[PDB]
């Protein structure tokens, strides 16, 4: 609840404070959230229980996206485009935090997507960090990042697009983690799920919203099923 | 929205249909959700736009928990306690789906926790699937599973407990994935985050709600930071 699911937000704040050791914008956002967490806990201690619940729900998404940004910064310490999009999401998050602090309604509108934005951002960051010599789709992942930048511009045309990008990253991050612990059965199994993933991405880049999303989700599911065996192959 | 974030639910339904190839209870729940998705889309096409949004929000959590259950079944095909808790969550999900279909209000009450229940369930399932020879904490993970079963009984005393169990699994799943792609710097780095994780778990099993949650979250954050380097160590 407003103080019984804010202990989960408190563990999230403790994780982010220990996972955002750089980007002082991240530390400042964590401090503004803890103050917003403090403001909600005071409203949770005050008679403003519904306002407490609303502020706590906003700060929960805030802490979730902040953890996404911190994990991205930890997983994208070498990608300049990723650091740029991360600082951009940090500025957008400060703007959305000022808007919600202004009672703006439109808080869970851009941050509604900026939450998914930080999700896909940490997704691409993990895809790059768990990569190695042969990314083989980091260009596509950069294209997706471009599509994410495009989603950064498509934020209304990015609600399902952010989900599709995250699912494609998951099919890539599953394949990336499989190839990471591989020295080649896991690589061959991920080469077939990555095939359907790239086919759907071209279809998702062909204006296919349901069919390409379904194909990418099925490719990700098959990749996760093969990862269940690849995790015992080493 | 009620039809602009239901395309994301549609990609979720496509993933779950391709990720729940066993447990016909999972296929039946996916079918009831798609019918509930169809009912909301009809209400989204009808003048019942607020009812459409409510049913779509319920079905979104339903599809999320169903994907959690499918990924668990894919990651817990060998744990009888996990399969038992999975069938139990499937029965609880059918009950909550009948309750929400009855307009029961108490839908996002047990399913509110049953969503977190499926979250922690898929978490423990991934912890077991990405494990290998030396689990070294699968007993603790089973204890956590017991604590999850206890959470399965503590569902009111499990709202923050489910979050804590998921965070401890994440600190374990990070360490598990690090040791998976390791042949031992990543193992030594995860041995120190796992130390604080077990210390907090004993503290979390010592009735420590804020301190133990904070320690486990910080251990998970440090483990994720070390995983950023461990992902490039192979």
């Amino acid at each position: 609840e407003f103080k019984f699911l804010a202990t989960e937000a408190k563990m999230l704040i403790t994780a982010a404070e220990r996972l955002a050791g750089t980007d002082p914008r991240l530390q400042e956002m964590v401090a503004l959230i803890k103050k917003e967490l403090e403001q909600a806990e005071r409203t949770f201690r005050n008679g403003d229980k519904s306002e407490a619940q609303r502020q706590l729900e906003f700060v929960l998404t805030a802490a979730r996206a902040v953890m996404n940004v911190a994990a991205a910064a930890n997983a994208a310490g070498t990608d300049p485009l990723l650091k740029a999009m991360v600082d951009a999401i940090l500025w957008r998050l400060k703007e959305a935090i000022r808007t919600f602090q202004n009672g703006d309604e439109e808080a869970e509108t851009q941050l509604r997507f900026v939450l998914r934005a930080a999700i896909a951002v940490a997704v691409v960051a993990a895809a790059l960090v768990l990569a190695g010599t042969d990314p083989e789709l980091q260009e596509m992942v950069e294209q997706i990042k471009d599509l994410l930048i495009s989603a950064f511009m498509a934020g209304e045309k990015a609600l399902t697009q952010l989900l599709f990008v995250a699912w494609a990253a998951h099919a890539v991050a599953m394949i990336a983690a499989a190839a990471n612990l591989a020295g080649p059965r896991l690589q061959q199994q991920v080469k077939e799920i990555l095939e359907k993933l790239k086919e759907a991405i071209e279809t998702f880049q062909k204006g296919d919203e349901e069919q390409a999303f379904r194909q990418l989700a099925e490719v990700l599911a098959e990749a996760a099923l093969v990862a269940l065996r690849a995790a015992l192959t080493n | 929205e009620f039809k602009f974030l239901a395309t994301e639910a549609k990609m979720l339904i496509t993933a779950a249909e391709r990720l729940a190839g066993t447990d016909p209870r999972l296929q039946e729940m996916v079918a009831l959700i798609k019918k509930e998705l169809e009912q909301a889309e009809r209400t989204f096409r009808n003048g019942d736009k607020s009812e459409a949004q409510r049913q779509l929000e319920f079905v979104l959590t339903a599809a999320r928990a169903v994907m959690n259950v499918a990924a668990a079944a894919n990651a817990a095909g060998t744990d009888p306690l996990l399969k038992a808790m999975v069938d139990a969550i499937l029965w609880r999900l059918k009950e909550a789906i009948r309750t929400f279909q009855n307009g029961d209000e108490e839908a996002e009450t047990q399913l509110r926790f049953v969503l977190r229940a499926a979250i922690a369930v898929a978490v423990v399932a991934a912890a077991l699937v990405l494990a290998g020879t030396d689990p070294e904490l699968q007993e603790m993970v089973e204890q956590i599973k017991d604590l999850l079963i206890s959470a399965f009984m503590a569902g009111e005393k499990a709202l923050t407990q489910l979050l804590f169990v998921a965070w401890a699994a994440h600190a374990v799943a990070m360490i598990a994935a690090a040791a998976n792609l390791a042949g031992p710097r990543l193992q030594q780095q995860v041995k120190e985050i796992l130390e604080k994780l077990k210390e907090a778990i004993e503290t979390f099993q010592k009735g420590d709600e804020e301190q133990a949650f904070r320690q486990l979250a910080e251990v998970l954050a440090e483990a994720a930071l070390v995983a950023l380097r461990a992902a490039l160590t192979n």
Binding site: - | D87, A88, E142
Partner: protein, 168 residues
């Protein structure tokens, strides 16, 4: 009389736990006695009886379930584990794995109603296999999947009625 009843039911809980093979539930029962919670005491007692009936049946799922229920002091979960261990014994006598799944699920959900449903459904399946009533076994399986104690008892009584009819 609350603290005295708590100490007594918790001593019985620890005894039935040691007899079940649970020294952990025995210690949790000693703690329920020291705290003076008759609810937690009877919970550890029902969980110890559940673990005994499980050791008689042979399911470590309900065993650990009753262990955790005693460690926490869950009376509903302990009664569910006890009725589910009874269901597991009745199923091992019958031989229905879906019934065992439903019983373990009732023990995990702590639904003592669903646990009595699984017990009556295992009894119904046994009575149907003894009588040869496939409709009774189908109703028993449906009640076990649904967790309806009334439907499972009805399937049991219908299998018994079919047995009495075939004998008559």
């Amino acid at each position: 009389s609350t603290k005295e009843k708590a100490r007594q039911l918790a001593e019985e809980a620890k005894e039935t736990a040691e007899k079940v093979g649970d020294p952990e539930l025995i210690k949790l029962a000693e703690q329920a006695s020291q705290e003076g919670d008759s609810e937690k005491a009877k919970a550890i007692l029902l969980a110890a009886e559940a673990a005994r009936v499980a050791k008689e049946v042979g399911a470590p799922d309900l065993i650990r379930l009753a262990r955790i229920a005693a460690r926490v002091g869950a009376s509903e979960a302990a009664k569910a584990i006890l009725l589910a261990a009874e269901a597991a014994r009745v199923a091992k006598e019958v031989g229905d794995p879906e019934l065992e799944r439903l019983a373990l699920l009732a023990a995990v959900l702590g639904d003592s109603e669903k646990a009595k449903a699984i017990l009556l459904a295992a009894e119904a399946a046994r009575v149907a296999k003894e009588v040869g009533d496939p409709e009774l076994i189908k109703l028993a399986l449906e009640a076990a999947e649904r967790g309806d104690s009334e439907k499972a008892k009805a399937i049991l009584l219908a299998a018994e009625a079919a047995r009495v009819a075939k004998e008559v």
